[PDB]
Amino acid sequence: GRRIQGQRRGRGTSTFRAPSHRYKADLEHRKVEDGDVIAGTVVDIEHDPARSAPVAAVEFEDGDRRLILAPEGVGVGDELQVGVSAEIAPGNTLPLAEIPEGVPVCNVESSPGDGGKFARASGVNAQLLTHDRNVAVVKLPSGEMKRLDPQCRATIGVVAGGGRTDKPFVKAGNKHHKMKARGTKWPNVRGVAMNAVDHPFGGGGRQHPGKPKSISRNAPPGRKVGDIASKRTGRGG
Template sequence: MAPGQHRVERIEYDPGRSAHIALLSIKEGNKINYSYIVASDGLRAGQQIESFRSGIPERLIKELGDTSDAGLLATKTCHPGNCLPLHMVPPGTAVFNVGKAKHGPAKFCRSAGTYATVIGKNEGDAKWADFVDVKLKSGEVLHIQKDCCCTIGIASNVDYNHRQLGKAGRSRWLGIRPTVRGVAMNASDHPHGGGRGKSKGNRNPVSPWGILTKGGYKTRKKSKVNRYVVKARPRSESKKAKKAKKLKKNK
């Protein structure tokens, strides 16, 4: 979204994404320019939203009495649909369309109903002073540059995960093909195939090409750890580990 005040013309459906999109208009001289953004939940036609990508405008500083108090600034800027750099967002605010680079596009929380939470500014830490801590929907906490932009609110169409496709044909339109269990195939078609009954021959779960599928095949080297990850997202546990944890809890 270009810097400045925009008017929401209408909310539209986008067949290429799960969230809705908003058509914006901005007057520049004698010309009206149009652009699209991912709509925030609750955004309606006729509303005014603003982008602060290029910083705080002079009219807003004068309106606040030539002060740059963070609390007063947040009351004027942190409204759903507004685009702000992360360092202008107060901790605890829900944001989406979070960028990864200063002038780059949004990378995190772009699908329907998703959001991230700004949880810290690292002002007391010299090493990470230029970064803001953001907690993603998965539970992962990341260091993201403070000049990266985000949109205030939650991505629209929050009930998307409750939709019912209704028939197998609609799944095929979405590119979802039928899934067949490996144990139901012939031995020549899958490593789990063949034999009598539903047995996979006491073998660890593998893909049709023989690669371990349940946490056994690691793809990231230990030397290539992402240093921007403060807290990794919770990983799925095996049935055995879940059962052991449940028994320990009941004791």
Template sequence: MLQPRVALRGLQLPFRCLSSISSRAPYLRSYSTEVQQPEKPQQETPPPAEESSTTFDPSIAFAPPPTRDEAGVQLRTYKPRTPGVRHLRRPINDHLWKGRPVHKLTFPKKGQSRGGRNSSGRVTVRHRGGGHKRRIRIVDFERKAPGPHVVERIEHDPGRTAHIALVRSQETGKLSYILAADGMRAGDVVQSYMSGIPEDLWKSMGGVVDPGVLAARTAWRGNCLPLHMIPVGTLIFNVGLYPGKGGKLCRSAGTFATVIAKGGETPQKDITTMGPEFTTAADGTEKTEEARPLTQREKQKIERAANHVTIRLQSGEVRLIHKDCCATIGVASNPNYQYTQIGKAGRSRWLGIRPTVRGVAMNAMDHPHGGGRGKSKGNVDPKSPWGLPAKSGYKTRPKWKVNKAVVVPRPRNQGKRRRGYN
């Protein structure tokens, strides 16, 4: 129903009653329309990884951040033939694969885990259940396989908001799924350097690590590198938390982090031993203090700075990540997902999302806010369904600041006047 109609211009119809349709074919309108925006100059595609070009263009190598201006967002709208289509908005992703996924790289999602239950069958996540039958795609977050990989196609993954790319190794021919970067298309060549620098790249640098040449040859969009090989200021996604493990951070659609500092770029006084210092006394004379050995805390600080890389997340949080953790150059694909409008409640049920009911609309046995006559919480503080305070910073304050309420039993008839007593 949501597909555009097939134009009937030029078709020879054998039925006389359908001859009028062909005459009106130029005036037929499709179900879906695209919001056209001013065209922006397209960036050139980076050369394949196997070429030995040493030219470095930051506009090509590093993926730019996604646009945050709604005027530049392209969404597909639909003709309101039904109420559920009137407010439907979808990002335009015409480059996605229209067929099924590779069957051997998927497994079915079934069982009680689809309904938000744990191993004992109890509901641990509310508002989950139902939904369309789906298969889980096996995504390679570690990217340990070396060598160039050719992107076969870009696919939609129903289990995540970002797109995935089907890549084939040029050396072994093995297929695998990886997280697609924004701007990645079929035919691109990506490579992983988690197992080390290739031999041909060593020879091109003369057997010595040249940071400029190394960045120009490796820091391309979609390549997976250790954090210590990524230049400062690069946008990355699919960032790992532990060496040898897969990516954990910035895996959702349109997310990215920024490398702001590396261990070798810390101030010199922080990474060397404490040498002689010059101080000025009250009378104006300068005194020299002798060098002292480093304390255990200072040694740990120096070692931590040398073995970690500082990154900034989109939330503004600054984190120290080990230099051997993996990261992918670029921005996670499908950045316009945040502007999606599903249009109707039934589409949420297809996604496995059940309705959310307000507490004041429940009975007293189902929620602390339930019961009573009319819209009333029963003169109680906002609480969760399990009786925990829901506001006033209860969840955001540190535990040592939370004052646990001590319930003291009140003596019988205290504070009440009984008949016959003053």
């Protein structure tokens, strides 16, 4: 047959790329020698096209102007701190080790110094649970218990823009606008609505997959469609 859409994606052609030339910046934590002698002032709150959430422009003591992943409750004029000795308040960044247990955090690093990987989306937050000298236990937004190096840096508080998902798009036109700001091909044509040549589910007098949808983890690209390695399906049981 022909390659399915999922295979066209990987070539990274314009149609599937994210409008990167329009993106502002990557909200990675600052790199500090030590001492925590780094503080800056929130000079402005901006819109981040890539995340549909707000971001804060900060001016640091040493003259560095950079955008930061903003937690909720951060405003212009406010002073932020980043370091081991940083104070324990919303908007500040410091290693998990220095963070007190039971404090909601965001933009948590995976490996000390990477800049933050976890909990960066609208209104989300990781929950620092357990401490230690060798392992910091964090509960990620998905509910998973993640064991992290206590040296991994994070930002106190939850990500700004929460509740974004609580309101429906109402119309296609709204979805449309959002999609134009992401690396995504939209709208979506169902597999069963295509010709046999274009998808495992195409073809047939009436629409219906001519096979079970749960596909094996080992299936090759082009065949891995539908419910991938589902441990179960439906709502019952």
